[PDB]
């Protein structure tokens, strides 16, 4: 009955725990105890991008590492040329409370979404000369957190109703849905091979998902409150999370257990955004203390600080060629660092 | 500088002027957050205010803009993300009073909303809705059949009204950094904007004077 099934589940949980514990032959700190510290990193502003009238909430780099899109809580997207601080496009939105954006790999489309529970896909190359909306995707029952392109016809969507979805843009209907969380979901990221993707869900738990099948393969635990950010390591078999516990964590998908913890005693504010670097050596994170911190991933120490903003930092991004870093905060300014 | 980046710079300047045309409107805007109930007649109130997931309304009173946000029953969201209404200056709460059996339910929502951290520097404007069925029910159905702490007679309207206001007011922990306001409206449909206007003006003056008093 119910009791026998619960006992079998407990036995399986004990099996999983024993398997996880048996593989802990070493810690991450002991293997890398002979690697030279990075020293000190003193980055500086190269350009300051001005023009927004409210708080920035998301940004995304392009595939050529020269163009970018930014979005704020006044209903506007701006496409900037970062070399000459030119404005290439300004697109008005239909709703003002919008919480995500993305940049299609081919350079033809963009996306946005928020509290209206609908995801909008915009087309850039037109014979008439304007940027006009192409698709509206609807079907969720809760607010929209993140959305990322996969191809020119397939998109991925995560909401706060405990589900995730894969959409075919041409037709306009879901092809597969992912269920299995308890609380609402906040962030997701995609592997370089574009076959799997990971997401965290405000229950101190994270899950890895398979696209071609529709089933959840594995989940990890360890935090104590919400999860606010997640990112992929370049090789596609690792990830890192930040939480409102002011604690950052690094997990691996083949060890099936937690690997590293980043924490300090003078920090009492949570993490809003996390991103990686080209070689995986710099782990960058924005905090609620009005600044951003540059961590050495393989050491779990403080390598640098970026302290140029006058409010909370909520957007962080890194280039595809490794030449720049971009930050956006509640002060209505974007900054480019090199 | 290359006969084609000059045109790009001109394009960017045009876009800059188009953006800067809107700062003078963004800087003079007042936001209110509206909360109510399914039986509280929110739609009738909105219609009578001569206005027009989430609904937005924009209007103006005496040359001042106003924006109102209607949350279509999403109050089930109880996480910090949903507290992105930190720019709001007032929360407007419509509550029913003729259907006694639901009153308790409303309080359970009320105590949940006004005790959050982000709303400690904002004002609350309370409307007790329609407030005329009581005039025809207090002599028919006693208010003691649902509550026990009432002391007055079932028929005098003033005692019941004072009791209701006290019960609503006693739900605030560290009651108020900015005061609570309340009114009685049935079908007035004409004077509500003036009351909202005066209360918002008082809150903004409160903040201005506190800023001026820097010793």
């Amino acid at each position, epitope marked *: 009955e119910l009791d026998q099934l619960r006992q079998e589940a407990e036995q399986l949980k004990n099996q999983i725990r024993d398997a996880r514990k048996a593989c802990a032959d070493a810690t991450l700190s002991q293997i890398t105890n002979n690697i030279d510290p990075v020293g000190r990193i003193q980055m500086r502003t190269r350009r300051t991008l001005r023009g927004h009238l409210a708080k920035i909430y998301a940004m995304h780099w392009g595939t050529d590492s020269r163009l970018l899109v930014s979005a704020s809580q006044d209903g506007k997207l701006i496409i900037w040329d970062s070399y000459t601080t030119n404005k290439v496009h300004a697109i008005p939105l239909r709703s003002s409370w919008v919480m995500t954006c993305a940049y299609a790999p081919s350079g033809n489309y963009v996306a946005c979404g928020g509290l209206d529970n609908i995801c909008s896909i915009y087309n850039l190359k037109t014979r008439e000369g304007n940027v006009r909306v192409s698709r509206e995707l609807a079907g969720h029952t809760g607010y929209l957190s993140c959305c990322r392109f996969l191809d020119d016809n397939q998109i991925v969507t995560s909401s706060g109703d405990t589900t995730c979805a894969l959409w075919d843009i041409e037709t306009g209907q879901q092809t597969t849905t992912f269920t299995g969380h308890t609380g609402d979901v906040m962030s997701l990221s995609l592997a370089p091979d574009t076959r799997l993707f990971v997401s965290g869900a405000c229950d101190a738990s994270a899950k890895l998902w398979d696209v071609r099948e529709g089933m959840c393969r594995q989940t990890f635990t360890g935090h104590e409150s919400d999860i606010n950010a997640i990112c992929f390591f370049p090789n596609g078999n690792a990830f890192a999370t930040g939480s409102d516990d002011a604690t950052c964590r690094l997990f691996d998908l083949r060890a099936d257990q937690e690997l590293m913890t980043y924490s300090h005693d003078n920090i009492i504010c949570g993490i809003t955004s996390v991103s990686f670097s080209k070689s995986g050596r710099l782990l960058l994170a924005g905090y609620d203390d009005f600044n951003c911190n540059v961590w050495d991933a393989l050491k779990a120490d403080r390598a640098g600080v970026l302290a140029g903003h006058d409010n909370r930092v909520s957007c962080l991004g890194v280039t595809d060629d490794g030449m720049a870093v971009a930050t956006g905060s509640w002060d209505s300014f974007l900054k480019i660092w090199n | 500088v290359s006969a084609e980046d000059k045109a790009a710079a*001109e*394009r960017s300047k045009e876009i800059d002027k188009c953006l800067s045309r809107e700062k003078t409107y963004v800087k003079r805007l007042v936001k209110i957050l509206l909360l109510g109930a399914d039986n509280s007649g929110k739609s009738t109130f909105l219609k009578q205010m001569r206005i027009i997931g989430i609904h937005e309304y924009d209007f103006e009173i005496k040359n001042v803009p106003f924006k109102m946000v209607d949350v279509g029953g999403q109050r089930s969201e109880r996480k910090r993300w949903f507290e992105c209404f930190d720019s709001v200056t007032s929360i407007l709460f419509l509550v029913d009073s003729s259907d006694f059996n639901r009153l308790t339910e409303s309080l359970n929502d009320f105590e949940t909303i006004v005790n959050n951290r982000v709303f400690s520097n904002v004002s609350i404007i309370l409307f007790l809705n329609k407030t005329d069925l009581l005039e025809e029910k207090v002599q028919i159905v006693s208010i003691k059949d649902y509550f026990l702490e009432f002391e007055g007679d079932p028929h005098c309207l003033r005692d019941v009204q004072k009791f209701l206001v006290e019960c609503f007011r006693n739900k605030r922990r560290d009651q108020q950094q900015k005061p609570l306001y309340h009114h009685f409206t049935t079908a007035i449909n004409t004077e509500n904007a003036r009351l909202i206007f005066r209360d918002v003006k008082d809150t903004i003056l409160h903040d201005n004077l506190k800023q001026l008093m820097l010793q």
Partner: single-chain antibody
Amino acid sequence: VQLVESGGGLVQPGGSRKLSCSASGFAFSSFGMHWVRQAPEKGLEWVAYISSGSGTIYYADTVKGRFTISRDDPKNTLFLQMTSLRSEDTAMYYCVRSIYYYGSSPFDFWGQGTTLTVSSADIVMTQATSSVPVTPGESVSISCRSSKSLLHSNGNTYLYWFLQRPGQSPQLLIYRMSNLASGVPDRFSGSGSGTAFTLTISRLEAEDVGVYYCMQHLEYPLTFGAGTKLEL
């Protein structure tokens, strides 16, 4: 899109004339306009340039002070006015659209033109030859020369390849010396060394004949070449 011009005719010496262009199908308030001329039996020459926002105007050296260029955004109509015509102003005119931002393709859509009859820092181009007999199935390379380097400091190159089929308006073949415009077969290419450039066509077929032109856009004014005619 679509552009329709009007205002041609036959004039007596002295007097004035006016030409108009009307647009349809696109956002005329975000584009820039050029007026180009053509001799009855010879190459092309730039006449005037106006830009969106009405900020800059450039005129030609041979006709400055007699002509005036103007636009009207809400009605989508462009005007050119000319005075005191001589026998050296017998020609056939065309309008051209171009847009400049990061990644654009200027000189994409050409109109249909009209006819008008009257009773040392510039870079000079020279066309290699006037006629080259070819046969279907072969490949062809057509080259022209310049007098100064066309590579600006920021990685660009400014030479444009257009084609004029018999009895039609010009169509863009290559913009910025190495790219390919929309709506064109994928068998064209372009390459060359500093100041000496060449367009390559493979698998010569029918309706692939005409006269080919190479144009420069580094610094006003714009200057054309003689043109090269192809015989299949």
